[PDB]
Amino acid sequence: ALVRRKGLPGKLADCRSTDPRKSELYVVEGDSAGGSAKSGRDSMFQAILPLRGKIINVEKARIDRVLKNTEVQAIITALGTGIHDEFDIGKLRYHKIVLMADADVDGQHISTLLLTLLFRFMRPLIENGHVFLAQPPLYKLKWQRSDPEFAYSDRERDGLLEAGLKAGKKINKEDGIQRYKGLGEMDAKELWETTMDPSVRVLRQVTLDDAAAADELFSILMGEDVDARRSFITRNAKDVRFLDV
Amino acid sequence: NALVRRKSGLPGKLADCRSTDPRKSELYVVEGDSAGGSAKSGRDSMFQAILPLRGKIINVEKARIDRVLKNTEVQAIITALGTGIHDEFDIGKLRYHKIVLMADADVDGQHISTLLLTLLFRFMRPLIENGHVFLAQPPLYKLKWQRSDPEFAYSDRERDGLLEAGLKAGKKINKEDGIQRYKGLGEMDAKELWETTMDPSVRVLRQVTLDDAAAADELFSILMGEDVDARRSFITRNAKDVRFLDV
Amino acid sequence: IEPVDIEQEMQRSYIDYAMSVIVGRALPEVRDGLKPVHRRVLYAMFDSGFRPDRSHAKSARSVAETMGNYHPHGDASIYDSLVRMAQPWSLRYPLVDGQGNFGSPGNDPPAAMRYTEARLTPLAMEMLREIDEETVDFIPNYDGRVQEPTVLPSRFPNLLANGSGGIAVGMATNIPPHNLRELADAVFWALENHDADEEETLAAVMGRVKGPDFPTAGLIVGSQGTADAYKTGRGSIRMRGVVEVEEDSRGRTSLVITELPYQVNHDNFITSIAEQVRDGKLAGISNIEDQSSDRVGLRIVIEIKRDAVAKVVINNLYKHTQLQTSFGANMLAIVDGVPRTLRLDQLIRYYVDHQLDVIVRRTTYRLRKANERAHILRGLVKALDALDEVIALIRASETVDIARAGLIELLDIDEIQAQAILDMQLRRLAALERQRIIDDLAKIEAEIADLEDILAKPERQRGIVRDELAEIVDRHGDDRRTRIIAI
Amino acid sequence: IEPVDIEQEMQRSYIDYAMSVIVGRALPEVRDGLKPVHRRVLYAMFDSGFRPDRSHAKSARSVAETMGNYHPHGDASIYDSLVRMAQPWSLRYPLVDGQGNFGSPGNDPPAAMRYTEARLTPLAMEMLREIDEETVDFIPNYDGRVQEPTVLPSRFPNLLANGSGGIAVGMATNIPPHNLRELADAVFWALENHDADEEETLAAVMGRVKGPDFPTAGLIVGSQGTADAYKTGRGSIRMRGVVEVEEDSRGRTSLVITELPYQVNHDNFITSIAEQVRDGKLAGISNIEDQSSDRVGLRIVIEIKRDAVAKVVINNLYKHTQLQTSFGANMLAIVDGVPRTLRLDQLIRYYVDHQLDVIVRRTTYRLRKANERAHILRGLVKALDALDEVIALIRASETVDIARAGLIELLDIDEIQAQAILDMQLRRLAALERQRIIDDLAKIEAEIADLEDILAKPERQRGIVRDELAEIVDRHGDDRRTRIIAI
DNA sequence: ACGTGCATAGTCATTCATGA
DNA sequence: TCATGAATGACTATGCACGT
C-alpha cells in the first residue's frame, strides 16, 4: 500500500484507494480533457495526470534535459518507480497506466512519445502489462427518444445507425451524430461512459514480444537519424493499412 | 546634467531613448502592450521613450505603501522616472522632463489616468507642480478621403467639421471603409500614433496644472480613498453637472 | 500646449468612469436583469442563429461575433461571461446551452474557447422573443455599422429569476435568484390587481415569492432577512447546506454533506475544513473524504470520533465554515438609466410595465404591417376587377415607368400598390390564386380589427402578458430547490 | 481487454502522424502553394465577405470562422498564421490586408487578436477568383457540415511568388519567394512553348526567373546556388544586406545598414553585433546605434575606429553576423498528394497545368449554366409569341398545375420552362422588357457559341490563362527588390 | 483577507529538419 | 544552440464594494 495526496506532482489528481493493485493512472492529453476526466472518474480507484503539450523525445534529447522537463518529472514522480537501473517495480503506485489521447494524429504522436519514454526509462512497466491505451469515441448518436450511443469507428457508426433505423428509432438531421475531434470536447459524463467506466471502456494492453526488434524500431522512428526515418516511412507507409489483415 | 540610457538597471518593459539630456527627453507612459509596441515603433527613438503599463494601476490611495512598492508596474514607473518618492524625492535625478500619460480615449483610459495622477500627486508631487506631467489626447476618428490625404479628428465635432469642409471642397469618401473609429491606442499602427500623439509638431498635449494643493488633496481622498460613502455622495452630487464644468 | 488643472481632470475623468460602470457595465437593467455584456452576447448568438433549433456552434464564433459587432472588449473576459451563463450552479435558469467542459462548482476551470460549443437555451429564446417586431428600442453599436438592442423583451422576469451580482463605483448589487413559478404568481397578481397601491402590492407579492431559490439547493434559515430584502432592498439571508448523519457497521458515525449554500466553492470548502482540523480547530472530526462523482453529485464524508456528538460537530461546521453562510442581499438595479434600490413590489411592477410596453409595441408593429399588406392587397383586387384593362395597359406601354404611371391613372392607385401589380407573377392570375388575394384581404382586415381592439383595451394587453407568461412557466418552470425552514 | 504489440502500435501511429504532417500540415500544395491552414483561413474570410470591397473585419471573426468550420485547431496558432500572411517582410505578396499592429521585423510581437482587424488583399482575391464556378474540387469539412476547397484557383503562381518554409517528418521544405513579373514571363513562355521538353523548358524558365526576390530586398551574391536550386531542387543562395559607408565631419567613418537578408531579425542582428563587441571579436567597431524609425526604415549605424578599415569591418560583419547569410533552398512541395522535390520547370509546368484545368472547368460550368438559362429563355420567347393565349389558359385553371400542364400542351414546353413562365412578373410584359427577353436569348446563344469554341480549342484556353494572368501582373506586379550581383 | 464579475495578454516548453 | 512555422493554454495582478 502507498499514501495518496490529500510530495507528488501538483497536476496529479490522485485516487483514494491506497492499493496500487486496485489503482489506475489515466495519463491524459490536455488540461481540458484532464479536467473533465478528473470529474467523471471514479475517485476511488482512478487518478488523473494531465500532460500539456508534445512530450519531449527521450530518444533525441540528452538525459539531463529530459530530467528537467516538467511533464516527464510528473510522470516519473507519479508512477513512483525510478528509471533505468534505479527502476523498482515494487514502488509502482498504479498497476494500470492508461494513456488517453485524442483520436487525431497529434494524439497518436503523443502516444509514441509516451511509449518511447516508457520503453527507454521504465521498460518493465510494458513487459508486465501495466501499460494500456484508451480508445476514445469518435461519434455520439443522439436518438430522438432512445438513449444515446457511442461509436469508436466509422464502421460502427454506420452499423449502429443502420440497426437503430431498422429498429424504428429516429435522429435529428441537425443535432444528429455528434463527432468528437478530441477528448477536450467531451464532458465528464461522456468520458466516464466511454473511456473510464471499467464495464464499457475499450482499453488495449501494450505487449512487448521482440525486445531487440522494438529497440531498433524505436531508434529508427524516434532517433536523430532523419534519413533512416525518411526511408522507413516511404518504405512502410504504403502498407500501413494492411498490418492487421 | 546627463544620464545613461539602457542599451543591451532599468525596467525590462522600458524602451529608452538615445538622448542623455533629460531636458530634451520624453517618457510616454502607455496603456497596454499593443499600444506600447506601436509607440515603440512610431516614436522618435532619439528623444522619446516608451513605458507600457499593463492592466489597471494599483490605487496608492487605498493600498498600503509596502504593497504599492511591491507592484511591478509602480516599480517600473518610479524606476524609469529615476526620482525617488515622498521625502526622498530629488527632481535633479529626473530622467525625463516630459512625462506624457497616453491612455485610450475610452472610459477605462480615463480611469487609468486618475490612478496614475494619484500615484504622481502622492509619491512625486513636484513633477506635477513643475509642469513635467502631460496628457496625450488620442484621435477618435480617421477620415479616409478617396484621393486626398487622410485626416484625424479628436472629437465628434471635429469629425463633423472636417467631413463638412472636405465635402464642400469637392473631396469624397467611401461609405464602406469611410471614417475609421478608434476605440483604443491598441488598434492604431506605428505611423498613426506618430502622426496624432507623438509627432511634437502635431500632437495634442495637455499640461497638468496644480493650483490649490489643499483642495486637490481633498478631491483625491474623496474620489480615490477608502471612504465609499463620501465617494458615492460626491458622484451623485457632481455627475449631474460634469458637462457644464467648462461652459 | 493647453493647460488643465488636476482637480478638473480628476473629477471629470473619474465621474465619467464611475457613471458608465454604474449604468453600462456592472449593474443590471431592471427590465431584463441583464448587464451590457450579457445582452450583447445573447443578441449576437441570437442574430447568428445559434439557437436550440440547430446544433451547437463553436463558442469562439459567439465570442468573435459579440466582439466584432457589439462589445468592443477582450475575447477572454467575454468568453468568461458566456461560460457563466451556461453553468447550472451559477444561473438558476441558464441562458446558454453549453456543450463540453464548462468547469465545476469547485476549482476545476472551464475548458478553453477552442474546446467548447454553445447555443442559446429555450428560456433565452424567450428573452429575445419577437425582438424583431420593434418591441424594444435599438441604438447604433460602438461604430454605427449595425444596430443593437437597448433592452431585451425578456418574456420572463429574468432579473428576479437569475439574480445579479456586480461591483460598480460607489455602489454594488447583489440580487439572489428566485423560483420562476413563484415569480409568475406575483406577476399574475400584479396584472389582476393593476390598481393596487404599493402597500397592498408588497404584501401580495411577498406572500407569493416565498424567498430566493438558489440553483445549488440547500437551506434558508429564518424569514427576517428575506423580509428585510423585500421591504428595504437590503437583507441578510442565512443559508445552509444539507447534512445527513450516517452510522457504520463498527458503529462509527459520519456526516455526509450533499448540498452547499449558493456560491460556495466545493474545493475551498473541503480545504477550509482540512486546514482547520489539522490545525486543531474542529476537533471531533476523525477523517475527511470527498466521495463526490458526476453520478452521485456532491458527497463530502466527515467521519467523527466516538467521543463526539454529531450535532455539536455540525454546529461547529456551521460556525467555522461556509456550510452555513449568509447571502448579503442588496436589490440594486438600473431604472431608466438611474441606479435604484428597489422593494420587491417595485421589481415586479417595473417588470410588468416592461411587459405591457413590449405587448403594446408588438401590437403596434403588427398593426402597421397589417395595414401595409392590406393596402397592397386592395391595390391587387382593383387590378383583378379590371384585369383585362390592366394587362392590355402594361403590354401597350413602351417602358415599365409608362406602365406604372398608367396604372396609377387607370385604377386610381398609389405608386406602391401599382408597383405591386407590376411585381405580380402570372401565377397569381389563376382562378384559385385570384381568390386567395380576395380571402387574404378579408383575412387581414379581420386581423387589423383584432389588433386595433387590443390597443384599445388595457384588459386584453394584461391578459396577453398573463397568458403568454403562463405558457412559458408551464413549459420551462421547475420545482423549488432551496428549502425554507424556521429558526 | 484486447492485446496490442508495441511495434505494431508505434509503426502505425507514427506513420499516420508523419503522413498527415507531410501531406496535410507542414508542406505546400504545388498548385496554389498553400498549406491547409492558409487555404482555410483565406476561404473562411472569403466566404465571410471579408473582402477589399468592405471595411476590415475584426480578425477574431476570421479566426473563429476558420476554427468553427474548416480548421479543427486552436485559435492562437491560427491567428499567428493569419498575422504572418499580412506582414510585408514575411510575404513577398501579402494575402491578408491587416489593420493595426501586426508586429515588426524585430522582436516587437503582433498585437493580440482583439486589437487587430483584417480582410483579404486584391491578390488574395485572385487566389480565390471564380472558386464558386466549380473551378476546384470541394470536399466535406472535418464534421461534414459544410464543403471546403481542396485547392484554390490561384490565378497567379503563388508558391513561387510567396515561397514556403515547413518542417514536416522525415523532410522539410524551403522555397524562396520570387518576383511576380519574372514568374509571369516564365509562365507565358511555358504557354507558348507548351510542347517543349523539360531540357528546353528549364533553360527558358531559368532565363526569365533571374532568382529569388525577397520582400526584405537585400542582395543575392553569386549565381551558382540559384542555378542549383532550379536544376536540382536544392541550392545554397548567398544573401547580403546593404551597407553604405558615411564619412563624418570629425573624420569618423560609420557603416549604415539599411537592408538585411531574408528572415533576419533586426533586434537579434543588433544584439549579435553588440555581444561580439562586448566579447571582443569585432574590433574596429567603436559604437553601435539603431537610428531606425517608421519613417526612414531600417538604419543601423556602426561607427568604426580611426585605425580601422571600413571594408575589413564589413567583411568581419559578413563573416560573424547575419549581414551575410545563406538561404538553404529545398524546393519541396506536395504533388498529387505526394511530397516531391521539383525543378523550376516542373514548378512552372505544374502551375500552368492547374491554370488550364481551372479555365476548362470554369468554361464547362459557364456553358452548363448558359444552356440552362437559354433553355428557359426559349420557353419565354414561345410565351411572348403566343402571349394572348398564355394568359387566357392560366385564368381558367383551378390550380397552377392545371395552368402549367396546359402551357406544356400549348407551346410544347418542359416542366422547367413552364414553371419559369409561371414565375414571370407582369413587369416583363412591357414592350422594352419583351424585347429584352429576345435580345437576352440572342446574347446567351452567342455566349454559348463562344464557350463551345473555347472547349474545342486548347489554343484559346492557353490564351485565356495568358491574357488574364497578364492583366493581374499589370495591376499587381511590382519592381524587383533583391538585387542580383556577381562574385 | 477572501470570494464575487466585468474591465484593463505576454510568457512559458516541447516535436520536427536543417544549417550555421 | 538558434531561427524558421504550424501543431499541441494555464498563470500572473491590479480596481471596485462588501461581509465574514
Ligand SMILES: COc1c(N2CCN[C@@H](C)C2)c(F)cc2c(=O)c(C(=O)O)cn(C3CC3)c12
Ligand atoms: C500548455 O502547453 C503550452 C505551453 N507550455 C506551458 C509550459 N509547460 C509546457 C509543457 C507547455 C506553451 F508554452 C505554449 C502553448 C501554446 O502556445 C499553445 C497554443 O495554443 O498556441 C498551447 N499550449 C498548450 C498544450 C496546448 C501551450
Ligand SMILES: COc1c(N2CCN[C@@H](C)C2)c(F)cc2c(=O)c(C(=O)O)cn(C3CC3)c12
Ligand atoms: C497583462 O495584464 C493582465 C494580467 N497581468 C499580468 C501580470 N502583470 C499584471 C500587472 C497584469 C493578468 F494577470 C491577467 C490579464 C487578463 O486576464 C486579461 C484578459 O483579457 O482577461 C488582460 N490582461 C491585460 C491588461 C489587459 C491581463
Ligand SMILES: [Mg+2]
Ligand atoms: Mg487533438
Ligand SMILES: [Mg+2]
Ligand atoms: Mg481601452
Ligand SMILES: [Mg+2]
Ligand atoms: Mg482574464
Ligand SMILES: [Mg+2]
Ligand atoms: Mg502558441
